Design an enzyme around this catalytic site. Sequence first.
Site, PDB file in Angstrom:
ATOM      1  N   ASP A  37     -29.455   5.195-116.573  1.00  0.00           N
ATOM      2  CA  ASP A  37     -29.540   4.336-115.566  1.00  0.00           C
ATOM      3  C   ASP A  37     -30.933   4.408-114.844  1.00  0.00           C
ATOM      4  O   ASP A  37     -31.112   3.852-113.842  1.00  0.00           O
ATOM      5  CB  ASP A  37     -28.636   4.813-114.481  1.00  0.00           C
ATOM      6  N   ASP A  55     -32.578  14.232-114.271  1.00  0.00           N
ATOM      7  CA  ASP A  55     -31.977  15.355-114.040  1.00  0.00           C
ATOM      8  C   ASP A  55     -33.387  16.369-114.105  1.00  0.00           C
ATOM      9  O   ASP A  55     -34.162  16.479-114.606  1.00  0.00           O
ATOM     10  CB  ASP A  55     -30.844  16.119-114.858  1.00  0.00           C
ATOM     11  N   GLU A  59     -26.772  23.504-118.893  1.00  0.00           N
ATOM     12  CA  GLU A  59     -27.480  22.122-118.477  1.00  0.00           C
ATOM     13  C   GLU A  59     -28.893  22.367-118.878  1.00  0.00           C
ATOM     14  O   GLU A  59     -29.616  21.242-119.062  1.00  0.00           O
ATOM     15  CB  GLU A  59     -27.411  22.154-117.016  1.00  0.00           C
ATOM     16  N   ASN A  99     -31.870   9.853-117.826  1.00  0.00           N
ATOM     17  CA  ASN A  99     -30.411   9.201-117.653  1.00  0.00           C
ATOM     18  C   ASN A  99     -30.726   7.796-118.166  1.00  0.00           C
ATOM     19  O   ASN A  99     -31.889   7.259-117.819  1.00  0.00           O
ATOM     20  CB  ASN A  99     -29.513   9.496-116.554  1.00  0.00           C
ATOM     21  N   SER A 117     -32.428   7.339-113.744  1.00  0.00           N
ATOM     22  CA  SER A 117     -32.722   8.680-112.953  1.00  0.00           C
ATOM     23  C   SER A 117     -32.842   9.760-113.750  1.00  0.00           C
ATOM     24  O   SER A 117     -32.841   9.568-115.111  1.00  0.00           O
ATOM     25  CB  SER A 117     -31.395   8.798-111.997  1.00  0.00           C
ATOM     26  N   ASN A 141     -29.782  15.862-110.078  1.00  0.00           N
ATOM     27  CA  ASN A 141     -30.067  14.294-110.336  1.00  0.00           C
ATOM     28  C   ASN A 141     -30.718  13.507-109.316  1.00  0.00           C
ATOM     29  O   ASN A 141     -30.310  14.077-107.957  1.00  0.00           O
ATOM     30  CB  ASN A 141     -28.564  13.363-110.606  1.00  0.00           C
TER      31      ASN A 141
HETATM   32  C1  LIG Z   1     -25.095  17.983-110.204  1.00  0.00           C
HETATM   33  C2  LIG Z   1     -25.945  16.732-111.086  1.00  0.00           C
HETATM   34  O1  LIG Z   1     -26.847  16.181-110.699  1.00  0.00           O
HETATM   35  N1  LIG Z   1     -25.342  16.477-112.241  1.00  0.00           N
HETATM   36  C3  LIG Z   1     -26.076  15.820-113.610  1.00  0.00           C
HETATM   37  C4  LIG Z   1     -25.343  14.318-113.161  1.00  0.00           C
HETATM   38  O2  LIG Z   1     -26.387  13.445-112.836  1.00  0.00           O
HETATM   39  C5  LIG Z   1     -24.790  13.926-114.849  1.00  0.00           C
HETATM   40  O3  LIG Z   1     -23.569  14.026-114.827  1.00  0.00           O
HETATM   41  C6  LIG Z   1     -25.753  14.458-115.864  1.00  0.00           C
HETATM   42  C7  LIG Z   1     -26.597  13.337-116.576  1.00  0.00           C
HETATM   43  O4  LIG Z   1     -27.140  13.556-117.957  1.00  0.00           O
HETATM   44  O5  LIG Z   1     -26.521  15.510-115.938  1.00  0.00           O
HETATM   45  C8  LIG Z   1     -26.094  16.344-114.819  1.00  0.00           C
HETATM   46  O6  LIG Z   1     -24.992  17.136-114.737  1.00  0.00           O
END
Ligand SMILES: CC(=O)N[C@@H]1[C@@H](O)[C@H](O)[C@@H](CO)O[C@@H]1O
Length: 129
Positions: free
Chosen positions: A48, A52, A35, A46, A50, A59
């Site tokens: 949308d 990470d 991650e 992301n 939001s 998120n």
């Molecule tokens: C637990 C968590 O917040 N996971 C996030 C999720 O928002 C998404 O699947 C991705 C977006 O790129 O990254 C991270 O996995």
Amino acid sequence: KVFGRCELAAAMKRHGLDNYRGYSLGNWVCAAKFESNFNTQATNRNTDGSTDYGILQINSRWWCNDGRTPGSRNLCNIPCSALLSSDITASVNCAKKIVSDGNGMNAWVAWRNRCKGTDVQAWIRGCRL
Ligand SMILES: CC(=O)N[C@@H]1[C@@H](O)[C@H](O)[C@@H](CO)O[C@@H]1O
Ligand SMILES: [Cl-]
Ligand SMILES: [Cl-]
Ligand SMILES: [Cl-]
Ligand SMILES: [Cl-]
Ligand code: NA
């Protein structure tokens, strides 16, 4: 802060992550590896709007507030910047809420695609735990 593999495993173990909700410590180390590459300051935008945040890429859509994700939740009741500190306490506590949401560690897309079903134990071997 860019953690070492065994350094991060010890920190996650001290904060109660090993075998939390039945997920051994190797799963959490592997997830953070894919991650954020062990980097507490990692951020990724992301589609949308939001973002990470941190070692586990939590998120802002549901879990933290960054002031720029309209109509989002702050279920962990923290600013998303707190997930970027060299102290992983806030990231671990919020992760315990995420993994308890009913879908387990499948909430982390990197863990499902790159750790789930693998030999996750190999991410803590050689570490003095
Ligand atoms: C637990 C968590 O917040 N996971 C996030 C999720 O928002 C998404 O699947 C991705 C977006 O790129 O990254 C991270 O996995
Ligand atoms: Cl393990
Ligand atoms: Cl917001
Ligand atoms: Cl820490
Ligand atoms: Cl589960
Ligand atoms: Na939010």
